[PDB]
From Swiss-Prot:
It comes from the Viruses. The chain holds residues 5325 to 5916 of 7096 of the full protein. Changing residue 321 to D: In strain: Gamma/P.1. Changing residue 77 to L: In strain: Delta/B.1.617.2. Residues 1-105 form the CV ZBD domain. This is Helicase nsp13. Zn(2+) 11 binds at residues 5, 8, 26, 29. Plays a role in viral RNA synthesis. Multi-functional protein with a zinc-binding domain in N-terminus displaying RNA and DNA duplex-unwinding activities with 5' to 3' polarity. Activity of helicase is dependent on magnesium. Binds to host TBK1 and inhibits TBK1 phosphorylation; the interaction with TBK1 decreases IRF3 phosphorylation, which leads to reduced IFN-beta production. The gene is rep. Residues 419-572 form the (+)RNA virus helicase C-terminal domain. Interacts with nsp8 to form the replication-transcription complex (RTC): nsp12, nsp7, two subunits of nsp8, and up to two subunits of nsp13. Interacts with host TBK1; this interaction inhibits TBK1 phosphorylation and decreases by 75% IRF3 phosphorylation, which leads to reduced IFN-beta production. A ribonucleoside 5'-triphosphate binds at residues 262-269.
Length: 572
């Protein structure tokens, strides 16, 4: 039972038995917790429970010290000291925010606000408690027993009675049985097996209830500012391609960590890979939460960095297909590309963490715990999409609360800002600049005269809760006949069910706003589907329209965002 207090560090025998993570609490702060919350079970070497035979008193406020043993008011000896007295819980070696993190259900937005505005050790306790709460929540749903196999990609599932059914998006990876991870999409459901196997009828599926490991390292290491570039050696022969980031590559070597806010197409990948050409001798580890983000960094490194010193780290429990053009798992190559969850135990001169709005504080801590670097660079954009908070149902999570890095980028500002968008037609750049970047994002391209908006509410149908708007897809089909150049367009919408219906009717490649992040396409057709808080979220709206290089057609439901779009309006 030896350990240190998660609130003030004062070493103690005490742990909270009612807390799902069982934190070490000191005599002072343990009392301050048990007297203010429903949490009264206090654990030590031996728990704080009445030692009298057959007595079920476990509330520490109802217990006393019988010399060296513990008893309740009904069994205590004449000479007994109350366990809960004078602002202390008796133990060895002798809080409003801690109580609110320890007792919350993580369904409200204020829970996530507090998990980011609290002290650094409370940010880790909150990150640990949240991830554990998310995992024990998997046990809640019902099992899916296969009823019929249509083909190599299609099946019919039978669900467990009494227990609710989980959302069937690629976001929920069902570990199926021992055959491996499997995902689903809509009585005809499409089965996405990671490991190709003859899906037998009658087989069952149970959700991935993984174990939450304790957090040791902070979300952000303590900041350090240096007078000269430290441990890094720059080139004087530095390519003119990367000359626009030279002042910022120097800022990187003159701080322990630095933040870079890069709106869509402002050159984040270019900045990240150019940092390697500026410090050519430096060992750089490129990390991000998603495999697609690490893959986008791999594609940029393939064009500028020597392929022999690059290595793509893939966890042997390989979930889905990723970058195949580097040597796999050579954990010591100068340039290492790896997701946060697969990070090995190593050191680096620079660590680059990309798509920082997708990181949680749990991921921020894991990176600091597995990688020990001279320099840490956080690239991303708080005006883009955050990680899905699968328990959160009440309130909206603002960008300053995505993680510690976004919190800094939104309060004190980012250390570096990429201000020129080189991807989008000016109509899109002018719209998102005013919408999320306070007019500091400039357009490099001219207005393409290929950005259109149509105000069309249509008809909203629901496949469970994922929305469909067939009349909006019908408007797209009517537009495509008259504008056949748009045949090459990617169809984007805030819902998978809308995308599924549009893929059958239009035939265009389909992408949700969330999965479109980091990618770019010449033409984008976007149907807003509904006027919900999800389809109206300005960060998702920002991602959706900033995917287009040449043109975009937005069929809108919200008068607010339709009026804000600086596109040519269309009739019908
Ligand atoms: Zn304490
Ligand atoms: Zn507790
Ligand atoms: Zn008793």
């Amino acid at each position: 039972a030896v350990g240190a207090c998660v609130l003030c560090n004062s070493q103690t025998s005490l742990r909270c038995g009612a807390c799902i993570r069982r934190p070490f609490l000191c005599c002072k702060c343990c009392y301050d917790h048990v007297i203010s919350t429903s949490h009264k079970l206090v654990l030590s070497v031996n728990p704080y429970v009445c030692n009298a035979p057959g007595c079920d008193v476990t509330d520490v406020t109802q217990l006393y010290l019988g010399g060296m043993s513990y008893y309740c008011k009904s069994h205590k000896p004449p000479i007994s000291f109350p366990l809960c007295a004078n602002g202390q819980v008796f133990g060895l070696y002798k809080v409003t925010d801690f109580n609110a993190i320890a007792t919350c259900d993580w369904t409200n937005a204020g829970d996530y606000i507090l998990a980011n505005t609290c002290t650094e050790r409370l940010k880790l306790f909150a990150a640990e408690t949240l991830k554990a709460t998310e995992e024990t929540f998997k046990l809640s749903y019902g099992i899916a027993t296969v009823r019929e196999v249509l083909s190599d990609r299609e099946l019919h599932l039978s669900w467990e009675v009494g227990k609710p059914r989980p959302p069937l998006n690629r976001n929920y990876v069902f570990t199926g049985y021992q055959i491996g991870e499997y995902t689903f999409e809509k009585d005809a459901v499409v089965y996405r097996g990671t490991t190709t196997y003859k899906l037998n009828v009658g087989d069952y599926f149970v959700l991935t209830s993984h174990t939450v490991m304790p957090l040791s390292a902070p979300t952000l290491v303590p900041q350090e500012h240096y007078v000269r570039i430290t441990g890094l050696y720059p080139t004087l022969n530095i390519s003119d391609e990367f000359s626009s980031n030279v002042a910022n590559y120097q800022k990187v070597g003159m701080q322990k960590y630095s933040t870079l806010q890069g709106p869509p197409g402002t050159g984040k990948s270019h900045f990240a890979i150019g940092l390697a050409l500026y410090y050519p001798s430096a060992r750089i580890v490129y990390t991000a939460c998603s495999h697609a983000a690490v893959d986008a960094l791999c594609e940029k490194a393939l064009k500028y960095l020597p392929i022999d010193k690059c290595s793509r780290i893939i966890p042997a429990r390989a979930r889905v297909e990723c970058f195949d053009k580097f040597k796999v798992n050579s954990t010591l190559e100068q340039y290492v590309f790896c997701t946060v969850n697969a990070l090995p135990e190593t050191t680096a001169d620079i660590v680059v963490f990309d798509e920082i709005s997708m990181a949680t504080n749990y991921d921020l801590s894991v990176v600091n715990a597995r990688l020990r670097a001279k320099h840490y660079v956080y690239i991303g954009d708080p005006a883009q999409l955050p990680a899905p908070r699968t328990l959160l149902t009440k309130g909206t999570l603002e960008p300053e609360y995505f993680n510690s890095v976004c919190r800094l980028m939104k309060t004190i500002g980012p250390d570096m800002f990429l201000g020129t968008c080189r991807r989008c037609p000016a109509e899109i750049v002018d719209t998102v600049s005013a919408l999320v970047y306070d007019n500091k994002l400039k357009a490099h391209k001219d207005k393409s005269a290929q950005c259109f908006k149509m105000f069309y509410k249509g008809v909203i149908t629901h496949d469970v809760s994922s929305a469909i708007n067939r009349p909006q897809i019908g408007v797209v089909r009517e537009f495509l006949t008259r504008n056949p150049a748009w045949r090459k367009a990617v169809f984007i919408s805030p819902y998978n069910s809308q995308n599924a219906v549009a893929s059958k009717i239009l035939g265009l490649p389909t992408q949700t706003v969330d999965s479109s992040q980091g990618s770019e396409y010449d033409y984008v057709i976007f149907t807003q589907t509904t006027e919900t808080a999800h389809s109206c979220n300005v960060n998702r709206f920002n991602v959706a329209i900033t995917r287009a290089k040449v043109g975009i057609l937005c069929i809108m439901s919200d008068r607010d965002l339709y009026d804000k779009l600086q596109f040519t309006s269309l009739e019908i």
